[PDB]
Amino acid sequence: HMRHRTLSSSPALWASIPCPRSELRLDLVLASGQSFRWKEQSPAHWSGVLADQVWTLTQTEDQLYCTVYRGDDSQVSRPTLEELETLHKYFQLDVSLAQLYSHWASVDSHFQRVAQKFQGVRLLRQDPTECLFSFICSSNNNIARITGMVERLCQAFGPRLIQLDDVTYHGFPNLHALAGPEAETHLRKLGLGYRARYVRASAKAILEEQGGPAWLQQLRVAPYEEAHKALCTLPGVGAKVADCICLMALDKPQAVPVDVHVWQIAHRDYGWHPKKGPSPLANKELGNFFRNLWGPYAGWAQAVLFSADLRQ
Ligand SMILES: O=C(Nc1noc2c1CCCC2)[C@@H]1CC12CCC2
Ligand code: NI
The missing domain is CATH 3.30.310.40 (TATA-Binding Protein)
Known part of the structure; x- marks a missing residue:
């Protein structure tokens, strides 16, 4: 057709x-x-x-x-x-990326070398609901498997939009659709595993405990630290997922998501050590280090290195 x-x-x-x-x-x-x-x-x-x-x-x-x-x-x-x-x-094209790239390069010789090859790496301004539940599926996962779980989740729960070739496109589900009594059982069948509980529980929590999606819009205009602490109350949302949502959906460009991967990069490329290994405190210290180094668009600078790291 x-x-x-x-x-x-x-x-x-x-x-x-x-x-x-x-x-x-x-x-x-x-x-x-x-x-x-x-x-x-x-x-x-x-x-x-x-x-x-x-x-x-x-x-x-x-x-x-x-x-x-x-x-x-x-x-x-x-x-x-x-x-x-x-x-x-x-x-977010109103923000000049060239000026940001040069500003970050001025204080970081490593970024400058990586920046040369990898230009035009910017941050998408995503929907909070879509972003929240996408990064609840991200725990102990890879881009390939996450892309599967999200597609299947939207097919099962989200409304159908159009078909092009053999690809059917569904909009992202509303919170009520993921909060249902059967929601978890279906999502386990779709292969999310333990993440199925966190999706249903978080959907139910925002509805009942926070009063629907207007809450996520309130966190957009709330200060970064208030937003992060609010998100960390949700089932399956810790510091790493909260920072991802803050950076990519709630207009907090200083948000620096820290897991073992950015730890590895920080150590190898910057020689950074906690002033032994990962820890809620050590992860928090690494985020402050990058904010101090790069400034209030630290999360945007991380995306350049992150995307640069995906390409060998
Ligand atoms: O972690 C992920 N994305 C990010 N974490 O920090 C940043 C990004 C993207 C850009 C800004 C910095 C996604 C979930 C995975 C695990 C392998 C793909
Ligand atoms: Ni070392």
Whole structure:
């Protein structure tokens, strides 16, 4: 009936956003442990779902090309003005990444060497609900398996949007849908394992203990430290997951997620030691170290190194 658009196939359905590849590289961002809902369905063409709509994204040297599938078998068209603002806000393009890259490089010789090769690594501004439950699935997991669990979770619980080729696209579920009495049993069948309990328990907790999704919007305007402590009350949400949500969904650019992986990197590349191994206190100290070094956009600087580390 319908299928994935390319820039060759249907150029009449594409809108451009003037964006250098030094400000944004899709292939270093869209599948680099931030979002798990983007796939390169055709080469250099990234498809995924953004707030009840499917997008396909490609780019040149100084143009980001995008096209929308609204579904409902309605009259197909280019992206609108409001839908391009949505994409502009999603990539946080108002913030200059080149200026940030140079600012971080000024105090960090290691970052400067890595920065050379890996440009346009920025932070996506994700939905809190989507981000929270995606990073509850992240514990003792890899990008490949997390991407599976999230896709299957959205198919099972989330509303259907459109089909392109053999790929059916579902929007992310609401909290009520994940809070049901059967929710955990289904999610174990979908292969989440122990993470199934934390998804249901956290969904039920935000509803009953915090009063629905308006709470997560309150944490967006709340100070970083208040937001982090609030999230750590949720089942299966510790310091690492709280910092991820803070950094990627609650506009806290100074949030530095710390697990064994960033510990390994911090030690090997910066020679950092707690002033022996991991610990709630030692992890907290490593986050402060990077904030002190890089400043109030420390989480954005981490994404560059993190995405750089995924590519050998
Ligand atoms: O940990 C993950 N992502 C991140 N943690 O810290 C940062 C990121 C992405 C960018 C900012 C810094 C995701 C869950 C995994 C485990 C392997 C993929
Ligand atoms: Ni050492």
